[model samples]
Target: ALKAPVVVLGAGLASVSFVAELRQAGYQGLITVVGDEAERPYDRPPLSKDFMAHGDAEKIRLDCKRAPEVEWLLGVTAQSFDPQAHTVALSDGRTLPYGTLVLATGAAPRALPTLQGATMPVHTLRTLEDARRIQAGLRPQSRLLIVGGGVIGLELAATARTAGVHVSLVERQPRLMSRAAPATLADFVARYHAAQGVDLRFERSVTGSVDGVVLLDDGTRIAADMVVVGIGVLANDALARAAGLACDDGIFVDAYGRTTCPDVYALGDVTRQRNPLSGRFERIETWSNAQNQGIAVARHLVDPTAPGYAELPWYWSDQGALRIQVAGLASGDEEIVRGEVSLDAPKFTLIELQKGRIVGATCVNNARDFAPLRRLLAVGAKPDRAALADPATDLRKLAAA
Candidate 1:
């Protein structure tokens, strides 16, 4: 029953996923995707990974075979929106109206204030252009200073090191990935990156940037050819805010991706939806969230009776040779460690529980054991700690149980 002229704000994974779902779900309405970027939709995950190594932009290109006829307006940003008038104003001075509008505006990387107006080039990897620019600076024997020890920072650190570049990483927190990961997981990742010859500096802050020199709060001066800040990202909620939609850091969207305004829906990093495990409305900035949430929204619009999007949170990262996967809530009262926690390789799983409920599961280099544990956590199936720790016990059996 959804009407024609569905306008999507982003042309990234979220927008493309929505179009793919809509087409498969038997929607024959007019779909127009508008993106700020100059290029067509491309995979962002590769921007921080393979694309950085090979510099193959085509490999990371996104295909919309599901809706090849779908209209796309790339290289133009959405300036503002009039929710009441049911139209969006673009940077190119064009106005577009739609029966249903999907806001997948996405988010932008956070920058260090001191380096904001610096003469030197400070990079933030959020797009294809960003990847190419950073890759160009990643030369052998070049000094690369990375700010932040989050997923992107750590991954780039590994990539930079492998390229024969001298890499040094600084995090404002006491540990790596302090927010998304648990201390147990962070500890080993710190060791893993360090073992790979990274200069990991924790609990450090950049005081100022003078010329090409970066000053640290701890009174350390690090001169570098380039600096990339992967501290975090801020949701692109300005357009939504101008439209008077409810937003706290991110636009608040319901299970059906409906914002406070009628006919205007939102999904992806720009949306702060309900986290079923934590029971809080938060922006899940992950590739999985963008892809799945976009599909969820499209399905809901095509069939109103479809259950709302309350997907469990999931994220994975590859740093050097280590593949880290995390699911459910990381903060829990009780914790169980399977396999050796200190070992970087050979695989391990850390389970977190609260009030006798399986709340979190973190796996390092072990996808075989990860799927079952994630499924069990999703269903609130609490396995015995003793059995969970035993290598002989089967995880799939626990998932079945």
Candidate 2:
């Protein structure tokens, strides 16, 4: 039996970051990470963007030179868990004992089953392998059908369009990124993609398919040589669920990534933790949350009495030349607007107001300005509406207030 002071399951962003932060925080325990993927831990945000678009894997690889002491069991899946024995069983029939366990299994991409010829020439962009496969299928005159208008779908649409492939995006929702962004923001983003030559279809569900023709709910059909499904992600909470942990949308965790079971923690895409900024528990499937939560978990594990993780939530997505950055979580009651910045300009910021108070903010192509705005939102500082109303008012200065 392999014994370690800390045994982290799944070598995605969460486990890697947890180990990295543990070492950074002066914890010199035996850290062993078991990952199901063959490749070493890497940044997944670029898997669908630069990694797939330019075929650059090294660019998206997570920097782990600082934490080289941890033992890595790559390409190995955890088969079972015995909470009573404090041991995890592996697919190879090996059992590993741990003083503490972290579940960072992350998630898998949702599939589209409606299309005919489902097995051949269809793709989903979630892992490095998925990206590579899709990249290989991209060729001039290739007709690509992306089933979903979320971030992954839109990003793939942009990539396929850049490669000069005919692209079509179908979404059952009325607008793109319906769950992530407000309707106004979704409409604006949809318009941006539409202007970029993406055949964006809304209020239409893909029902059946014949040959390469994708039949929609309205009896409309679109021809496709290849189909890519990006309907979002499902948390890999099977182990936690089987172990009788509080599993809903994901493995439920507290502010510090602690589960209901003692000495058990969860982070990254697999964890549904309370969002301190939004005052709600949410399952955020983003790289930023994974990294931040991992760090917090590491710090707390070293000393349970240490301060809880209270960092503000942040996320970013780069599609073509558009860089979308978001800070804080906005609730349904929050007011969303296109801010004073011109939407036509390459750089713009969208602000969310709750009861006339600024709660969340998103910036596109304006990283520098958004940096300070994020700080303001972190501290719950609200900027004057009049100042924010004028595009001339320096955002950085308003954020400073």
Task: Point to the candidate with the largest lDDT.
Answer: 1
In candidate 1, stretches whose alpha carbon ends up further than 4 angstroms from where it belongs are 342-344
Question: In angstroms, how far off is 309's CA in candidate 2?
Answer: 2.1
- Model 2 agreement with the true structure over 1-401: per-residue lDDT tens digits: 11248899999888888899888877887888999889968887787777776787888888887777998999899987888889999987789998888999998887676754454477778888988888887897799999999888888888788889899999998888865665655767787788888888889988878766778999888889888988888899999989989999699988778888777889999988777766788888877888888888888877778787787777777777678887775443555444443447666777777666667778878788788878777777666766665777887876655
Tell me which residue pairs clash in candidate 1.
Answer: none
Task: Estimate, for each residue in 302-400, the C-alpha lDDT of model 1 and write its tens digit.
Answer: 999899886798899988788999998877998888888665354888999987788998989889889998888888886777887788889988787
lDDT of predicted model 2: 0.80
Candidate 2 weakest ten by summed lDDT:
334-343
The C-alpha TM-scores of every prediction are 0.97, 0.94
Segments of candidate 2 deviating more than 4 angstroms: 1-4, 116-120, 330-344
